[PDB]
């Protein structure tokens, strides 16, 4: 029963369900019997922590394709890189 | 089912009984495919 961590991309194994995600507070109201919550396309987007019975959202962590903007090798060797789909607080 | 034995009708062990009011309906289950509609709170509010 290792302690919970939030807002970090942490691999997780709950009561038999395992995935890698950032776990954050959830506004979803789960009925008592329900353990996990799945969105359309069979992906688990919510889990209820067994120890404190609290609903925690799961969101995949960042993955975007770096692209390189080059003035052209003949003009210059400078380049600028676009990390796609990343809020620029997680790039380093 | 509970059987009510009362001082009113001692009778014999077979006749010491009162029906009162009871109703039970038994319907067997079969393999079936159902489309279940879940609302915002997650309750199954409809099925076909």
């Amino acid at each position: 029963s290792t302690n919970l961590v939030k807002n970090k991309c942490v691999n997780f194994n709950f009561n038999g369900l395992t995935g890698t995600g950032v776990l954050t507070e959830s506004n979803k109201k789960f009925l008592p019997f329900q353990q996990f919550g799945r969105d359309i396309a069979d992906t688990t987007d919510a889990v209820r922590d067994p120890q404190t019975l609290e609903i925690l959202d799961i969101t995949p962590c960042s993955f975007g394709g770096v692209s390189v903007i080059t003035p052209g090798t003949n003009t210059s060797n400078q380049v600028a890189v676009l990390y796609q789909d990343v809020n620029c607080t997680e790039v380093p | 089912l509970a059987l009510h034995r009362s001082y009113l009708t001692p009778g014999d062990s077979s006749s010491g009984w009162t029906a009162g009011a009871a109703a039970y309906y038994v319907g067997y289950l079969q393999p079936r495919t159902f489309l279940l509609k879940y609302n915002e709170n997650g309750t199954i509010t409809d099925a076909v």
Binding site: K28, F30, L31, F33, Q34, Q35, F36, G37, R38, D39, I40, A46 | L3, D12, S13, S14, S15, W17, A19, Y25, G27, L29, F34, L35, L36, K37, Y38, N39, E40, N41, G42, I44, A47
Partner: peptide, 30 residues
């Protein structure tokens, strides 16, 4: 034992549906 006891069928109108799993689905038709 028991004695002195003095079947019909009724339609089950859309009844007997039970939550199939422990998953939570919201606004989905499954």
């Amino acid at each position: 034992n028991l004695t002195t006891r003095t079947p019909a069928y009724t339609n089950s109108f859309t009844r007997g549906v039970y939550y199939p799993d422990k998953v939570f689905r919201s606004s989905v038709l499954h």
